[PDB]
Each structure stands twice: as structure tokens, then as C-alpha cells.
Write a protein that binds this ligand. Sequence first.
Ligand code: MN
Length: 180
Amino acid sequence: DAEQRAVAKALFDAVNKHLSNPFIEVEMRLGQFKANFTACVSTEDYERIKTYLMTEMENSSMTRSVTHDVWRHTYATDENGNPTRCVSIVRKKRLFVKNIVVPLGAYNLRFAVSTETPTRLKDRLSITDGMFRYDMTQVTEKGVLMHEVEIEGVFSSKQLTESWLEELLRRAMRLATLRT
Ligand SMILES: [Mn+2]
């Protein structure tokens, strides 16, 4: 009856709260071997990858964000670069990691699949081309400045296909070999 419906609704809401919304992140990160794989590119190669992406872009769209990181707690920043407050808290567990065999002269590529479930400073610029998101991040994690580039997409319950993976590897190889 009516009381039963109130209990079941509460059980339903409590179940979903304990489920959360667990999505899957598939990413291909550029990097080098130089404590082995370092997910960074040179400054000059970084600016040329960006030149490539802005030339390629046609949707007149991008997102920039300066955040502070420290389960990871992400803190926003105001107009002067000072922290505001947490805008997200997420646990990232890597499920699958793989080194890609790249052509000679190319940047190395690391393939990573992670579950994300709702100190470093990140200045990130993100572009979308088709069903792929490009992230260009300048990271500082211990006084060291790293130029990071990755291509990625997120899935949950948007499902992952072999076609999307095939194009992800194609698009990543294009950035990895940009200088050659
Ligand atoms: Mn990422």
C-alpha cells in the first residue's frame, strides 16, 4: 500500500546513492621513456601539437581551467590563480594499462582505462574533435613543469566500441608523430 511505497522509494534512493554513477575513462597519453614512462612532451612539440589542434578545430569550442589537486580533491581558482573550493572529489582506479608500440622518432603512447567514482597544479586546455576530447595540460607537481597531451573519452551504462578505439589510436599516432 502507501506505506510500502514510501519504504521502497527510500530503498531505491539509498541504493542509487551507494551505486553512484561509475563511468569508464579510456585515454591515450603521449610521453617518453627517460621511473620509466614519463607522460610529458617537450615545450616546442607541445606548442606545435596545439597549433595542429587549433588549425584542425572547426567547432569554435574549447574549455580552459586552472585547478589545484591533492581519492583526489580538485580545487578551483579565482581570477588571480588562488584556490577557491572543491568542485569535485573522485577516486580513480586504473583497470588496464598498456604501452603502445610506436614508430621510430614518435612520442611514446600509454593506453589507460580507469574507473572514476564521485599536490599538483593543472592549467588544462581541452578541445573536442568528433567523439574525442584532447587535453593539453601544463602540470606542476613538485616545482617541475610538465607539458602533457592526451586524447580520451568517457563511457558509462555511451558505450565503447572497437571503431572508437581504432580511431583513438589513429588520432594518437597523428599527434605522436607530428614532428616526423
Ligand atoms: Mn586524463
